[PDB]
Design a protein around this nucleic acid. Structure first.
Ligand SMILES: [Mg+2]
Ligand SMILES: [Mg+2]
Ligand SMILES: [Mg+2]
Ligand SMILES: [Mg+2]
Ligand SMILES: [Mg+2]
Ligand SMILES: [Mg+2]
Ligand SMILES: [Mg+2]
Ligand SMILES: [Mg+2]
Ligand SMILES: [Mg+2]
Ligand SMILES: [Mg+2]
Ligand SMILES: [Mg+2]
Ligand SMILES: [Mg+2]
Ligand SMILES: [Mg+2]
Ligand SMILES: [Mg+2]
Ligand SMILES: [Mg+2]
Ligand SMILES: [Mg+2]
Ligand SMILES: [Mg+2]
Ligand SMILES: [Mg+2]
Ligand SMILES: [Mg+2]
Ligand SMILES: [Mg+2]
Ligand SMILES: [Mg+2]
Ligand SMILES: [Mg+2]
Ligand SMILES: [Mg+2]
Ligand SMILES: [Mg+2]
Ligand SMILES: [Mg+2]
Ligand SMILES: [Mg+2]
Ligand SMILES: [Mg+2]
Ligand SMILES: [Mg+2]
Ligand SMILES: [Mg+2]
Ligand SMILES: [Mg+2]
Ligand SMILES: [Mg+2]
Ligand SMILES: [Mg+2]
Ligand SMILES: [Mg+2]
Lengths: 579, 51, 183, 109, 62
RNA sequence: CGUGGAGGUCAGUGACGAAGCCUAGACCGUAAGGUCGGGUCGAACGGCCUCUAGUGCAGAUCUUGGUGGUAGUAGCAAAUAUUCAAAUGAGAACUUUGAAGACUGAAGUGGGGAAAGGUUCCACGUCAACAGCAGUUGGACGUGGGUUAGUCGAUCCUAAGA
RNA sequence: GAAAUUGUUGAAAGGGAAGGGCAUUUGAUCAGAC
């Protein structure tokens, strides 16, 4: 049928989201294939920097292609005939200190980036370059779908100087910044929620000073914890984080813009940062506009974070970005700032002028194209699934079995032809770009002096349903992203922050799904090879005497045993080197 | 997909462009009533029947 | 607001006012007075009928030169019409009135239209063209309307008889004689 | 109430168009048919199958035929309530001569 | 929908009079989306649009 | 008798309402006019003694502005002609499409230009005002796109002339 | 925010104009009084 009906809404959404064996093996191939990916990048990363000189330092644009084209290597070999949709979920995005995410440069642009920032520099000298300097917090985000099922990898690798005084290649010294306080806060919190999602399968071995038997896991439980880990480490939980439930051809990030009925998850926005500061005075007055936008199934898609309660037979994503705080006297709001392609906006030496390297196709928007180049891109972008891509993936030569300079040239000549079909699509809004954002801290005392004539609440943002419209909530009434930039753009009070982003996928299985085990926790992108911390020393950590903290140490070593009723598997990577 | 979009509307635009057509119409009628009198001024007219 | 003066109790009445509408002032004023004082449910059906030419609007003031019809006999006048456009706006103000009434909590079958008035909007001005190359004003007589519906109160019967009686000294002794006679 | 009919009427157009303006003659027939069918089955909502149109105009504005054989159907109105639940539909019947034919109920099946 | 333009381009692409252009009444939503010549091209060969036959002037009588 | 301004005076009146305006409410004066109450209004004004003048209106086929009666009347009639369905639509005599009927009938109601127009061409949006009925359409309104010459013109030559 | 002019309500009146004058009737409406 052309009509999408209630018969099939049931056949598509609940069915393919049934946990069955045919389904799990698709996820299992993704767990390794993705970890087989990070293990490859990780390899290439240190080969260039940590050890001896291999005759070129790879660049970030360099490592992106090799990474991606490797993740094509592994989808050639699996479900080749069996499955129609197999591809890259999120493109390799290598990020640096102040960058939240969204950074996926094509090869073409290292002379473009270089050019634009030629004048304004010295903060970002790593990003523009592509060469990575020491003492950086570097995310690597990968994801892959097989048959529309997504496994995502995110990890924060710190790079070190190189000490050859020890023949053993020792990364001299620990990481002594408040920087490292972030990555060990996320590394801690990652294990934190890892052990929490085990207790919703059965209320067995669940921390007593916390939940009881009344709630295996609640909307409030997980949220109370992570902000505890934060306030513990004084690391601001980023406004971009979430804990998500996933489906076939439905994942959290795929479309942040397009709406989802029957929404399941924990959400974190700036509308939540006032509630924590505003828990001092308990005033319940909500000043509300009656607008009927995102009205359809508002109940399900409003993203209630209290009503989420963990189930078994669900696939979850844990997404955590924790912004460190260099000491900030007056309390402030943690926000994200967006990076543009136009130099003129700014005379500030600290700005980044760059280009978005990720894209998305909205099947909602239909516009007839007059150009013949932007048409060949359109019917091609539709020859791929519902997930974000860059213009390189679309081509004949992109996997490029034998990598030559002749092939590096084959793609560059194509990128330009696809640049031109990209203009005509991006202006007609048939496709949305991925926001490239920075970590931005703001003083509370700018926003409370705020004087505004009111204005546009109009929908320009990738932000999700409810929270975005006013951004800073109603109790701050009068503020939208626009007046927020204005505030954020009085700059003596502005500052930016390092970030540690961590992505784990967790598949809850009962004893019907996992036989040999009894009820289990499957960690995809959790492999012992991928989750390695880096040398870190921070004086904050581990606040005792809070009933929620003492319950995490109880639960921290609880998942540490094989008498633990829920056995936590870690998918091991694949074998890389073959020749 | 639950996102339901008909709406695009701005009162500021409609209302404030409303006065505009309403002001200038007031000025066009006013250029009419100034000249209404002698609009029919016809020097060097030839009566057909009069002597 | 500030309507034309009302003898109504404001709490029990509803009100609707359009303005600067495009309509014959001379025609809409007529259609008004046809329905003035009526019950609402009534007049509504009536205007409907007129729109089909079952009833008409007697033209009681600006009548001059019109054609005389049978349907006039009803109101006992020979001059009447079916001002189709004039009605659309009255129904409009009637339709609305019914609605503003129900949000105040007033009974829909106890409603009637007490107060209906139409005065003149600023005339609007075009150009027109005549023989010998002259020019004349070409205009409309746009019309203000307001409609105040009342909740029928028949509950008023009040006893007012005020006698401060000055009777003369003669007049007193002469009543005293009628009541001495064992009236 | 009223029930859902069909019939076949011959109409005398010759008499109804008598002495009309040659230029407006045909267009009358259009009105004289809609009026005629609001007579029988006083439905008041009458529609004309464009074939019938080609029948009324086949001879030109001045040349309308003397007699038509017309299939008229009373049917129910849909959605969007019109003042009437009920319908009227006139369309042609292809026939040698309109002459000497009697009104007939065509039994629907 | 307003199909004037589509009928104009039809006469130009087909290269025949607006008299002789047929637009499928049932296709009125699809023809709407034409808006350019090369699109009309597709529609013309597709058969949603058609160049109507020349009316006849017969010389047999003469 | 009154009016616009000046010198003087009532240590005059006034945001607890000044001036103005409305008033089949009162009062003095033959009258010109003064005086009070009510309503409306929101910032300056009045009495006496004197000075001054662009100092008093029913008119002038008076000057500009404003409005009736006439009157929902005159009229909206040349160019042979329109009709049925569907679509769109808060709404269709008039828009779009199909169908049928007709007209210009090659000295055309066709296809191109000069003079003049200056964006009226085209498209997306749109219906307050304009298209002497309508309006979902437009030579209207709002946002934009559109004119590519070694060979077509100007340019050069000379004509009556300047 | 005046007048002309106009709508609504109130009152009043009217056999080919209306309007004024002297005078009192009937209807309204107000001062003086101590
Ligand atoms: Mg005059
Ligand atoms: Mg007369
Ligand atoms: Mg007459
Ligand atoms: Mg004229
Ligand atoms: Mg002339
Ligand atoms: Mg005759
Ligand atoms: Mg005086
Ligand atoms: Mg003066
Ligand atoms: Mg005053
Ligand atoms: Mg008076
Ligand atoms: Mg003078
Ligand atoms: Mg004067
Ligand atoms: Mg005068
Ligand atoms: Mg005069
Ligand atoms: Mg006049
Ligand atoms: Mg007339
Ligand atoms: Mg006319
Ligand atoms: Mg005439
Ligand atoms: Mg004519
Ligand atoms: Mg017409
Ligand atoms: Mg002819
Ligand atoms: Mg002829
Ligand atoms: Mg022409
Ligand atoms: Mg031309
Ligand atoms: Mg045009
Ligand atoms: Mg248009
Ligand atoms: Mg008009
Ligand atoms: Mg109009
Ligand atoms: Mg224009
Ligand atoms: Mg050449
Ligand atoms: Mg030449
Ligand atoms: Mg005013
Ligand atoms: Mg007056």
């Amino acid at each position: 049928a052309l009509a999408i009906s209630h018969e099939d809404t049931q056949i598509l959404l609940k069915d393919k989201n049934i946990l069955q064996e045919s389904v799990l093996n698709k996820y299992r191939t993704a767990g390794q294939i993705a970890q087989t990916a990070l293990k490859y990048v990780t390899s290439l990363i240190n080969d260039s920097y940590h050890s001896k000189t291999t005759q070129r330092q790879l660049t970030v644009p360099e490592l992106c292609l090799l990474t991606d084209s490797f993740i094509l290597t592994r989808l050639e070999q699996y479900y080749k005939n069996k499955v129609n949709e197999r591809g890259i979920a999120i493109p390799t995005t290598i990020d640096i200190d102040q960058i939240s995410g969204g950074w996926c440069p094509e090869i073409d642009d290292t002379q473009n980036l270089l050019n634009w920032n030629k004048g304004k520099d010295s903060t970002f000298a790593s990003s523009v370059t592509g060469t990575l300097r020491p003492g950086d917090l570097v995310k690597i985000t990968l994801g892959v779908h097989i048959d529309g099922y997504t496994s995502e990898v995110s990890h924060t690798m710190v790079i070190y100087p190189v000490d050859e005084t020890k023949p053993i290649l020792q990364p001299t010294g620990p990481l002594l910044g408040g920087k490292a306080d972030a990555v060990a806060a996320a590394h801690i919190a990652m294990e934190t929620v890892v052990a929490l999602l085990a207790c919703a399968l059965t209320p067995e071995k669940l921390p007593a000073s916390l939940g009881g038997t009344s709630s295996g896991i609640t909307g409030q439980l997980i949220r109370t914890i992570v902000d505890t880990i934060a306030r513990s480490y004084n690391c601001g939980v980023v406004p971009g984080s979430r804990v998500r439930r996933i489906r076939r051809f439905l994942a959290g990030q795929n479309e942040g813009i397009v709406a989802e009925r029957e929404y399941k998850g924990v959400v974190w926005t700036e509308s939540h940062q006032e509630a924590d500061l505003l828990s001092n005075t308990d005033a319940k007055d909500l000043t509300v506009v009656d607008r009927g936008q995102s009205t359809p199934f508002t109940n399900v898609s409003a993203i209630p974070s209290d009503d989420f309660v963990v189930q078994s037979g669900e696939v979850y994503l844990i997404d955590l970005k924790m912004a460190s705080l260099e000491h900030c006297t007056k309390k402030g709001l943690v926000t994200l700032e967006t990076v543009d392609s136009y130099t003129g906006k700014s005379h500030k030496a600290g700005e980044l002028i760059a280009r978005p390297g990720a894209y998305v196709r909205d099947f909602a928007q239909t516009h007839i194209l007059k150009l013949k180049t932007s048409r060949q891109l359109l019917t091609k972008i539709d020859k791929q699934g519902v997930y974000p891509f860059k213009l390189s993936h679309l081509s004949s030569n992109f996997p490029f079995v034998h990598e030559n300079e002749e092939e590096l040239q084959s793609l560059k000549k194509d990128l330009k032809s696809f640049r031109l079909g990209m203009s005509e699509i991006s202006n007609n809004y048939l496709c949305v770009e991925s926001p490239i954002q920075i970590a931005r801290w703001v003083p509370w005392d700018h926003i409370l002096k705020a004087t505004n004539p009111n204005g546009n609440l109009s929908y320009d943002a990738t932000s999700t349903l409810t929270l975005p419209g006013h951004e800073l909530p109603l109790p701050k009434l009068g503020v939208s992203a626009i007046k927020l930039k204005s505030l954020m753009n009085s700059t003596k009070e502005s500052i930016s922050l390092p970030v540690a982003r961590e992505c784990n996928t967790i598949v809850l299985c009962d004893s019907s799904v996992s036989t040999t085990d009894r009820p289990e926790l499957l960690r995809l992108t959790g492999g012992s090879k991928t989750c390695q911390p880096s040398w870190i020393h921070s004086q904050h950590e581990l606040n005792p005497q809070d009933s929620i903290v003492q319950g995490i140490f109880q639960l921290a070593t609880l998942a540490k045993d094989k008498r633990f009723g829920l056995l936590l598997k870690e998918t091991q990577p694949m074998k890389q080197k073959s020749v | 997909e639950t996102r339901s979009f008909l709406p695009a509307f701005d009162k500021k635009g409609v209302q404030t462009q409303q006065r505009v057509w309403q002001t200038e119409r007031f000025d066009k009628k006013r250029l009419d009533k100034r000249s209404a009198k002698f609009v029919n001024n016809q020097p060097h007219y030839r009566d057909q029947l009069l002597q | 607001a500030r309507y034309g003066a009302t003898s109504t109790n404001p709490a029990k009445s509803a009100s609707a006012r359009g303005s600067y509408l495009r309509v014959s002032f001379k025609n809409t004023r007529e259609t008004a007075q046809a329905i003035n004082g009526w019950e609402l449910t009534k007049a509504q059906k009536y205007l409907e009928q007129v729109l089909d030419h079952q009833r008409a609007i007697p033209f009681r003031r600006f009548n001059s030169s019109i054609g005389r019809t049978a349907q006039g006999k009803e109101f006992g006048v020979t001059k009447a019409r079916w001002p189709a456009k004039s009605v659309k706006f009255v129904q409009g103000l009637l339709q609305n009135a019914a609605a503003n009434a129900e949000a105040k909590g007033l009974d829909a079958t106890k409603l009637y239209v007490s107060h209906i008035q139409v005065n003149q909007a600023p005339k609007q001005r075009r150009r027109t063209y005549r023989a010998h190359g002259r020019i004349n004003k070409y205009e409309s007589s746009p019309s203000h309307i307001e409609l105040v519906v009342t909740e029928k109160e028949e509950a008023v019967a009040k006893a007012a008889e005020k006698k401060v009686v000055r009777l003369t000294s003669r007049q007193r002794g002469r009543i005293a004689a009628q009541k001495r006679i064992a009236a | 109430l009223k029930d859902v009919v069909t019939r076949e009427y011959t109409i005398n157009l010759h008499k109804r168009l008598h002495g009309v303006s040659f230029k407006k003659r045909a267009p009358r027939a259009v009105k004289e048919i809609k009026k005629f069918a609001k007579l029988h089955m006083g439905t008041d909502d009458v529609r004309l199958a464009p074939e019938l149109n080609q029948a009324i105009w086949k001879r030109g504005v001045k040349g309308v035929e003397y007699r038509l054989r017309l299939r008229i159907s009373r049917k129910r109105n849909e959605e969007e309530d019109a003042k009437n639940p009920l319908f009227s539909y006139v369309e042609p019947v292809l026939v040698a001569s309109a002459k000497g034919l009697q009104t007939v109920v065509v039994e629907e099946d | 929908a307003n199909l004037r333009t589509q009928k104009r381009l039809a006469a130009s692409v087909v290269g025949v009079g607006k008299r002789k252009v047929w637009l499928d009444p049932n296709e009125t939503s699809e023809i709407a989306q034409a808006n350019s010549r090369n699109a009309i091209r597709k529609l013309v060969k597709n058969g949603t649009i058609v160049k109507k036959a020349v009316t006849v002037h017969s010389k047999s009588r003469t």
